[PDB]
Design goal:
Layout lengths: L1 E9 L2 E10 L4 E9 L9 E7 L8 H5 L3 H7 L2 E5 L37 H16 L2 E10 L1 H12 L7 E4 L9 H11 L11 H7 L6 E6 L5 H5 L1 H10 L4 E6 L6 H19 L2
Helix pairs in contact: 6-8
The structure holds chloride ion.
């Protein structure tokens, strides 16, 4: 029902990969965890959930973001789920932008996708329950992500404000109802009635937010997807309009890659630590 697949010592702590049978997705799922050195002492540690973007697995961030150094110092565990259901019986598309690697963190209502594409319930309900049951962790959590995963973090935090201390993102999809990535995925997973899409749009949620989760967003100015897919100005406008605690930082010359993420991940860890320690 749960299997440790791999272990690698990392900055006096541990990077470990698991597979488990998901009740919400009705499929096997892989996730990775980083436990800091403090978890070896008897301490319970807080958890940063990291959600990845299109095509990614539970490996990309663990390998490339360089988060382990500071997570170790600050005593933060990081949990990185995969980006979609995977395996036998799970629908898929040949394109990188739909199906596997592309769950969009929604609960799909349209067949065939509705059978397995319940990534919102997985991230919000099943995964944290599992993590808290297995690992030496507290009930204090935060959430972050990149692009589709930034969309994931923001939308989940805004709809579950009591559940998350803080939220952050790199290159988030802010207004997915108004971009091709969001439109393709939402039409396929949720159908043609865009009223059903509203609860999955960070910019729309933020404008209407009744309770604040502190937020930090970093955007590379040389990100090729900025205008068409990401639309940070649209998030800023929502924040402005709702007195929302959003710090949105634009960085000249930086792109959409993990090189950009690695460049500011320590900022994100110090930001989360501020709220996870409270
Ligand atoms: Cl993405």
């Amino acid at each position: 029902s749960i299997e440790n697949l791999s272990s690698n010592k990392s900055f006096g702590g541990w990077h470990k990969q698991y597979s488990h049978v998901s009740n919400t997705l009705n499929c096997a799922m892989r996730f990775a965890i980083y436990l800091p050195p403090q978890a070896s002492t008897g301490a319970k540690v807080p958890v940063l959930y990291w959600l990845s973007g299109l095509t990614c697995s539970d490996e990309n961030f663990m390998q490339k973001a360089g988060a382990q150094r500071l997570a170790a110092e600050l005593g933060i565990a990081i949990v990185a789920p995969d980006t979609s259901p995977r395996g036998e019986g799970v629908a898929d598309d040949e394109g990188y932008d739909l199906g596997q690697g592309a769950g969009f963190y929604v609960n799909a209502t349209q067949a065939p996708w509705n059978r397995h594409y319940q990534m919102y319930d997985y991230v919000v309900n099943e995964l944290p329950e599992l993590i808290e049951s297995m690992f030496p962790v507290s009930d204090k959590r935060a959430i972050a992500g990149h692009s589709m995963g930034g969309h994931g973090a923001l939308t989940i935090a805004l709809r579950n404000p009591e559940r998350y201390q803080s939220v952050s993102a790199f290159s988030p999809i802010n207004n997915p109802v108004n971009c091709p990535w969001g439109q393709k995925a939402f039409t396929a997973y949720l159908g043609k009635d865009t009223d059903t899409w509203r609860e999955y749009d960070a910019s729309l949620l933020m404008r209407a937010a009744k309770q604040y989760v502190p937020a930090l967003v970093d955007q590379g100015e040389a990100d090729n997807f900025l205008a068409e897919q990401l639309k940070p100005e649209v998030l800023e406008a929502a924040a402005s309009s709702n007195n929302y605690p959003l710090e949105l930082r634009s960085h000249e010359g930086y792109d959409h890659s993990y090189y950009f993420i690695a460049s500011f991940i320590e900022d994100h860890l110090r930001f989360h630590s501020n709220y996870l320690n409270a």
